[PDB]
Amino acid sequence: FYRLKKIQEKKKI
Amino acid sequence: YLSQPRLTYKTVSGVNGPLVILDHVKFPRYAEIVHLTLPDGTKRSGQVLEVSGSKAVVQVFEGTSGIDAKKTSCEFTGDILRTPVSEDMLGRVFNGSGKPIDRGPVVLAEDFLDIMGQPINPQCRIYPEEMIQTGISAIDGMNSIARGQKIPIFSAAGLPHNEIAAQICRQAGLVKENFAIVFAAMGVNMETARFFKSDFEENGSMDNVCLFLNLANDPTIERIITPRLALTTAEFLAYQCEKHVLVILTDMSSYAEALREVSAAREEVPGRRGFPGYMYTDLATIYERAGRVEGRNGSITQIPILTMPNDDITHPIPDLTGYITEGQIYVDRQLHNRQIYPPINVLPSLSRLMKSAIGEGMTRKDHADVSNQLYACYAIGKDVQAMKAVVGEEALTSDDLLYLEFLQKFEKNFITQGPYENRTVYETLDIGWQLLRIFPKEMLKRIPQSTLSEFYP
Amino acid sequence: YLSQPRLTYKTVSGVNGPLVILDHVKFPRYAEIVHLTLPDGTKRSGQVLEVSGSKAVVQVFEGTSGIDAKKTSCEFTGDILRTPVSEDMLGRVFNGSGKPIDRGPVVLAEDFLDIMGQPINPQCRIYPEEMIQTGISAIDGMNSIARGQKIPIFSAAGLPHNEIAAQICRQAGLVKEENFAIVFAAMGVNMETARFFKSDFEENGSMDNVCLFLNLANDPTIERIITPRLALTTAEFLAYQCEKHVLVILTDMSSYAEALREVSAAREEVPGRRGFPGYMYTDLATIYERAGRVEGRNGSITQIPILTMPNDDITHPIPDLTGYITEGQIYVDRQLHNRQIYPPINVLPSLSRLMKSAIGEGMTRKDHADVSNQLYACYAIGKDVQAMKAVVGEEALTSDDLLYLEFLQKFEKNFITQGPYENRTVYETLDIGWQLLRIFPKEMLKRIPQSTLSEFYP
Amino acid sequence: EKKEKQIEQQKKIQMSNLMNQARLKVLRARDDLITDLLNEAKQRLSKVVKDTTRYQVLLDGLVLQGLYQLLEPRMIVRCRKQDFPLVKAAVQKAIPMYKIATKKDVDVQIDQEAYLPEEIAGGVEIYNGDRKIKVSNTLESRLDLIAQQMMPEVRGALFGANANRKFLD
Amino acid sequence: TFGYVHGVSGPVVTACDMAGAAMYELVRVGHSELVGEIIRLEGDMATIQVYEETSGVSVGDPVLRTGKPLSVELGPGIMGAIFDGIQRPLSDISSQTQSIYIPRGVNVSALSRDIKWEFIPSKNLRVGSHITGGDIYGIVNENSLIKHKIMLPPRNRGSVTYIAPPGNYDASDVVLELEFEGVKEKFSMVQVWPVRQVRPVTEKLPANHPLLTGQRVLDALFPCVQGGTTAIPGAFGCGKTVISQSLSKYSNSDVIIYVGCGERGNEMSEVLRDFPELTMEVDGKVESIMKRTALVANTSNMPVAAREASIYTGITLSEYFRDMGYHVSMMADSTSRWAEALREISGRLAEMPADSGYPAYLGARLASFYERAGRVKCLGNPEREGSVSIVGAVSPPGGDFSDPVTSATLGIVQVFWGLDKKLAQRKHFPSVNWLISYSKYMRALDEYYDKHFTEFVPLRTKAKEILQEEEDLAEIVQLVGKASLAETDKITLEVAKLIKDDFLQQNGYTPYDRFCPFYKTVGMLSNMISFYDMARRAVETTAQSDNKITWSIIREHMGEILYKLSSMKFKDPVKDGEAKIKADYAQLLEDMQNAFRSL
């Protein structure tokens, strides 16, 4: 879950 | 010495959870403390976590609520969090943030001290070597409290640990003082708070106790700062005044909960069981303020109290607490179900400083050996009880009967104890020898021949 | 063939881990090779993994250290990496990047071959049918292999799998040219492993027909990505071109996986199970199947890689994915190693495609499959009764249970337990198997047909 | 028996070392010869430098290589100070060709402040305006490039193919 | 040029205006001089990890750059002192500031610039000779126990021009001047070295000599080798620190560097207090052991970033002394702490995580660190043979062996000493789980035993088999009680129990068991195995007779002899001659023989 949330947050840029 | 006016801001560029992001701050300072004004008449405070460009981030020590991006103001004092402190804080009771609640005036400070403290240089710290008598046989006889250590108290919900703390702080002494107590409470029931207060008032040593309180109704984030403040006060009294200060913390687990919450708000790296990855470092920072120093006769001892969520030991909180501290005193609910007033399971209760405070000159040469022998015998008692549980009474042997007898008499005499008694060390040793005499001479394999040739009969 | 003058670029717009980001490159090409100059005279090399607009990404083989945005320069070649190729590669040793590690000079590239290889028509491949004698009774027999197959060796840390590899390489031969050439490749190993393998190889005087590579633990991690493909390309050349029967020994593929993890994590690509990137299934497919004979040609490629096994996890991604690709597997168990068995090989999880290679008609002997199967089943029942033994005492066992226990015990004591340097023949192992069969009466031979049973049991 | 086994393995290791040394020496002889031939080629290049006419033609060619390669709006030309007027004339000759080849108007200056080191037998080099992108079209770089690209064919020419080279692809 | 502090967050700091920077260059940040390293570049911006607690730093604070990467100053004055995670003598700082706390930005010389040192140039050093690196060109008796050598730093060569005469010299005084190609250059008795660069060697050599440990358990069953490597995982309270202390006190090596990273400082206090008192005898002289040890410390409460620096500094020093021609060992305490530091730094960089939240390159870094070990033929014409051994200690959270840190370390080291919490719970203080432990240096050591203690070889094998067989029975004993087994089985169980209670147990804090010489262990095991096989053969020979000897009969026959065999462990290495204890063992063996024959 943590890894997926990290990539999702980075997807904004 | 600062002499410039503060800066005031209304640029509240955003909010997210317990954080507030400002914009267009002129040379912001890391770890700067900031006051602010809500649209109504109340006021709050916070601390800067990080800076980048002209943007800044702050954290509100008492929860964010109703803050208006247009109306509120901020005030940058330009300094890291610093507390007032004076000798006269003794006898006074504060809540979180040190605000008086005993109906006295503001704190008139002798000095202003940085909260975060500084590391102590290992070169110039003296190893503790003195033995603090305690009056409980489970502690002195088979472990050791020394002036300067930081042993914690493992406990579980509902179990009777508070009066253990009361007893240890009631009749503390030196084998053959003042013991200014500083007692910080972090998110605990009102009942325990009043219990401790009544106990100290009964002890009649109210001239030597400085209190900090935080009920569970108080703001959540306050708990992260609550203990550091008390420890700073203790350090002041220990080093600038060469007093012997004993320190007690109620619930480190609550502090851990506050910390996990803060870290989760920021989305930081998680490790075991949703904890911050760096909780080890902060626990080290809090726990490491201990031990005496070269040239000064003061001393700092810590007996923090922490609660495992359940009987599990591999939970990260007790595990890391074991890593930092040099031992631990275990409390088992099994003994509590059998109504033994100290429910101290001596077995998992290893302490590391029995080396340098025991032997000739301090107590006697035979202390360590009898403790080791008692360990071995109690352990074999547990094992034979396990064997009994499966095989049945009639399959055992005489040795098993002897071990069961030892187990029963040991739990009956050595551990079971009065609430208000005060056992001397020598009495504990006599009890130990009485217990040892149950076994024959030959079964005592943990004792040198030279010692049993003199003390066995 | 020729090409235009090469281009220099000095626009290093960032550095991040083992990657270096440039821009303003004119007509960048994917998988292009570049060189790097440092503020001093030191040189390095790398390749291109991503391209978009004038931006380009550059992986560095030697790692990253002291890289500047004002002194470091870059050079751009014109094509994919192409590497030296020659018969002289034998009798020589090289590092992870193929440079001469011994004192000999740069090999003379008789030709240039693409590292990435090139595909082969499935129709233009030939089944491998010749059983390769190994001498180990655990391998020959139960898990026979053929000339052109590939079999990984699953093993954990602290186990003597290296000894097994050396034993196999020593005794490699054919059942009845002279022998196999050897293309060895090391993937991040400590000095002990490499030195021991070197000593073993020079013991038999086989340096005249070994080309070897070395990537040690101290070397930069990124080199391991390129290291094994060089060895495979060279082996492919020797097999499909020189018609030499070769044996490629790869080791420590887990380090290859780790390097790929580094590369993916640096690029912030989508991760998957255990943080491993998705596409190493394709990558391992590329690195693995390069073997098997082909029509109209002689020589072959037999590939035995060695995979270390994190903890004891058969379901770990790396060994699992390797299971889906290779056609076999030979398992190593710490239990046998604790019981002092020099070839500690648990035969139960092992499996191979001897499925129609060790027929017996024309091959060694006719009974091969039957004896193998019966030993396998009896061993399984032996393990079962051993498990039942820990539940209830010895008194509760019937006569057949004791017979199974005794058969099991004698089986690992005799069949599995083989001494080093012992070159057992296939017929010898079959006879040993029969002697083990004789422990039971004929009526418990539930699997052997009537004909063979009456032929050999009496 | 183990004395005998020691003796036999001793002779085996000794012979293996001897064979390795033999291979080392012979391969070293081969590549030493190759480097010597490369040095001879450098000498042939150096004598080629001096014939004025073909040298001017080659400089025109190299300048046009640089023009077609960099493609930047601004350019700089560097060369050996002796050949300065020749390359000036070459640039004047070359600019119209590029103008009609790409339809792009570019300004070409010649660095008169810094010149190539003397050890460069000949050739030129181009920068762009900011002197961040470069392209070396010197004669030595060309010699290197064609040498490396030609190496296998020259092996085949000097020594012939191996007997085991049964087919090609 | 100079950068400016764009932003701060924890121990990481982004600095703009840093065009000329490069990776792994030292930098100074803040008005105070806070040392740090660079870890990421992006255009004109940069990233810096800082080794000091970050607080009270403004944006736009100046930042200085230097081309020197992280390095340590190497030379005399090192031993008997203590340093921080970076090379900073704590004692000198405490004398300089006259306080209790370390100043936030203290900056003092690594080595003293005033102590004088006697000097003796080499007897073969002539004007015009060549040494080309690695050659000792002088001797300094830094301390009575150990003599510091000075050799040309590697990557240096040229003829000899000036030679300093014998006598006394202070730091930075010109010792040797060298001329190579018209360039003159001077050297002193102190130099510099980058931390992350591997020092070159002539050649690595195989291990051929055992490295004792002073523990009956470790030396007997799971020996380590000089120049090798190992790891010691185990939960808290399993006494890893005790084993490290014992090894440092009673090894066979010359110099021991103890790198404590992320622990209680009370351990440092213990080392400071105990070691000066204890004395050791070599060359007919007794000297305090502080002279032969150097100590690098990093308390837990210190800033996180310094911890990697400490681990690197320690091995750099070990390397410098391996070049000197000595055997040295290392006590790396809690490398998992180093892993934790890596985790934090990667967290603040928003780098993609790997298993258990650690960075991907944890395995690579551990392998690189542990690769530095090994025996080495050194550079220089006067050949010396040195060696480096690393004895790491791991601290897996939860007490299991599933964390990636431990599994990574298992794949590198050759020797493994597992600890089991229940054993330390038993007060079986040297809690070594022989069942899980193993060692891959059994070979290349049999020659040593064949040359000295040939009988030990069968003995240990027999003991191992007995332990395994005990374990193989214990489960079925536990499931179903006694009175269902043959005499041989119970005999083996009981003798294995006494082995457990006596041989494996070892209390190193009593004065008489602080250290066990190897021959004592050999004799003890010999007596045990002799008794075991004698009893087993005796009972076996009477199996089919009319009077079967049972275990109860053996007890009635030899209870006192068993008691003496148990008390066998009470032999002090001092105050009791080797001859007398050996004779005592022989006499006990004769007694056992007589009692057996009488039956």
For D66-114, the DSSP string reads HHHHH--SEEEEE--GGGHHHHHHHHHHHHHHHHHHH----EEEE--SS
The answer, yes or no, to whether E and C have at least 3 beta-carbon pairs within 8 Å is yes
The pair of structure tokens assigned to E482 is 């006694």
Question: CB distance from C16 to chain E under 8 Å?
Answer: yes
Domain enclosing residue B165, as ranges: 1-457
Q: Which helix (H) or strand (E) holds B430?
A: helix B425-436
What method did the depositors use to determine the structure? cryo-EM
Counting runs of H as helices and runs of E as strands, what totals does chain D give? 4, 4
CA distance C28 to chain A (A): 25
Supply the angle between the helices E487-499 and E518-541 in degrees, to the nearest 10: 170
Residues of C with a Cβ under 8 Å from any A Cβ are: 268, 270-271, 275
CA distance E357 to chain B (A): 6
State the total domains in chain C: 1
Alpha-carbon distance E385 to E227, whole Å? 11
Please report, in range form, the residues annotated as the binding site of E. Answer: 234-241
Which chain B residues have a beta carbon less than 8 Å from that of A4?
none
Alpha-carbon distance B447 to B43, whole Å? 67
Q: What is the resolution of this structure in A?
A: 4.3
- Residue of C108, C208, C209, C240 to mutate when probing chain D, most D C-beta within 10 A: C108
Alpha-carbon distance E332 to B311, whole Å? 33
Rounded (5°) CA angle B424-B425-B431? 95
CA distance B350 to chain E (A): 8
A1-13 burial, b for 16+ CB within 10 Å, e for fewer?
Answer: eeeeebeeeeeee
Supply the angle between the helices C223-240 and C280-288 in degrees, to the nearest 10: 30
Residue E591, CB half-sphere, CA atoms under 13 Å: how many? 16
Alpha-carbon distance B265 to D62, whole Å? 64
Tell me whether residues C66 and E23 touch, CB distance under 8 A: yes
Question: CB distance from B343 to chain E under 8 Å?
Answer: no
Which chain A residues have a beta carbon less than 8 Å from that of C268?
7, 10
Q: Which helix (H) or strand (E) holds B164?
A: helix B162-170
Alpha-carbon distance E342 to E347, whole Å? 8
**Is beta strand E136-140 parallel, antiparallel or unpaired with respect to E62-65?**
unpaired
Alpha-carbon distance B82 to B33, whole Å? 9
Tell me whether residues D19 and C105 touch, CB distance under 8 A: no
Residues 393-452 of C with CB under 8 A from E: 393
Question: CB distance from D71 to chain C under 8 Å?
Answer: yes
Residue that the structure tokens 């005492």 belong to: C393
Supply the angle between the helices E456-479 and C368-391 in degrees, to the nearest 10: 70
The answer, yes or no, to whether E and D have at least 3 beta-carbon pairs within 8 Å is no
Quick one: closest CA in A to E350, which residue? Answer: A6
Of C8, C108, C111, Cβ closest to residue D135: C8
Which chain C residues have a beta carbon less than 8 Å from that of A3?
271, 275
Residue that the structure tokens 């090596």 belong to: E253
Mapping DSSP to helix (H, G, I), strand (E, B) and coil, where does residue B283 land? helix
Residue E119: strand pairing partners: E167
Alpha-carbon distance E267 to B323, whole Å? 13
Task: Tally A–C CB contacts below 8 A.
Answer: 6
Among E80, E416, E393, E106, which residue's Cα sits nearest to residue E255? E80
CB-CB contact of B304 with B153 (8 Å): yes
Among B31, B330, B416, which residue's Cα sits nearest to residue E104? B31
Nearby residues of E84 by Cβ (< 8 Å), 6 or more positions away: E90, E102, E296, E297, E298, E302, E306, E310
CA distance E351 to chain A (A): 10
Q: Which long-range contacts (CB under 8 A, 24 or more apart) does E35-39 make?
A: E35/E86, E36/E305, E37/E70, E39/E345, E39/E349
Residues of A with a Cβ under 8 Å from any B Cβ are: 2, 5, 9
CATH code of the domain containing C209: 3.40.50.12240
Alpha-carbon distance B184 to B171, whole Å? 20
The secondary structure of E374-401, three-state, reads: EEEECCCCCCCEEEEEEEEECCCHHHCC
Alpha-carbon distance C436 to C375, whole Å? 9
Residue C328's Cβ-count burial label (10 Å; 0-12, 13-18, 19+) is middle
Q: Where are the alpha helices (DSSP H) in C307-448?
A: 317-325, 334-338, 368-391, 399-411, 426-437
The pair of structure tokens assigned to E323 is 């070049």
Residues 348-367 of E with CB under 8 A from A: 350, 352-353, 357
CB-CB contact of E391 with E230 (8 Å): yes
Tell me whether residues E353 and A10 touch, CB distance under 8 A: no
CA distance A8 to chain C (A): 10
- Residue of D28, D137, D164 to mutate when probing chain C, most C C-beta within 10 A: D164
Among C246, C209, C228, which residue's Cα sits nearest to residue C89? C209
Question: CB distance from C361 to chain E under 8 Å?
Answer: no
Tell me whether residues C6 and D164 touch, CB distance under 8 A: no
CB-CB contact of C163 with C178 (8 Å): no
The torsion angles phi and psi of C17, rounded to 5 degrees, stand at 60, -135
Alpha-carbon distance E20 to E27, whole Å? 12
B189-207 burial, b for 16+ CB within 10 Å, e for fewer?
Answer: eeeebeebbebbeeeeeee
Mapping DSSP to helix (H, G, I), strand (E, B) and coil, where does residue E332 land? strand
- Residue of E369, E371, E485 to mutate when probing chain C, most C C-beta within 10 A: E371
D145-161 burial, b for 16+ CB within 10 Å, e for fewer?
Answer: beeeeebbeebeeeeee
